[PDB]
């Protein structure tokens, strides 16, 4: 596999741990695609379900956080089912990684500005 690597910006590396929900119900992700990788192995998974400051989302995610690997399982190219299958048993302790690129991460976010 090798088509190109146009969007390959310096990675930041953000490891987060999501333990069993302590009030809510964890989070909610959804990917699925199966298209050529950005830099050989990358798809970018999105989610939407912030927790009430507990071990479910706030632990690292934030309603739509850029993630690549889920619970140690590279979601690069994988499908929504591949990302959930990892959270199944990891429900008690999930380990997802967050990387920054020229896609998953929107320009609006790339800007480090306040909200006042």
Number of helices: 2
Gross geometry: globular
Structural class estimated from helices and strands: alpha+beta
Largest sheet: 2 strands, antiparallel
> Ends: how far apart?
46 Å
What is the number of E strands? 6
Can you characterise this structure?
There is one protein chain. The chain has 116 residues and is α+β, with helices and mostly antiparallel strands. The chain has one domain (1-116). The protein is 13% helix and 17% strand. The chain contains two helices and six strands, in the order E-E-E-E-E-H-E-H. It has helices spanning 80-90, 107-110; strands at residues 14-19, 29-30, 46-47, 69-70, 73-74, 93-98. It has a two-stranded antiparallel ribbon with strand order 1-6. It has a two-stranded antiparallel ribbon with strand order 2-3. A two-stranded antiparallel sheet has the order 4-5. A hairpin with a 2-residue loop joins strand 4 (69-70) and strand 5 (73-74). It is globular, with a radius of gyration of 14 Å.
Ordered list of secondary-structure elements with their pairings:
Blueprint: E1 14-19, E2 29-30, E3 46-47, E4 69-70, E5 73-74, H1 80-90, E6 93-98, H2 107-110
Antiparallel strand pairs: 1-6, 2-3, 4-5
Subcellular location: Cell membrane; Cell junction; Cell junction, Adherens junction; Cell projection, Lamellipodium
Modified residues (Phosphothreonine): 113
Modified residues (Phosphoserine): 51
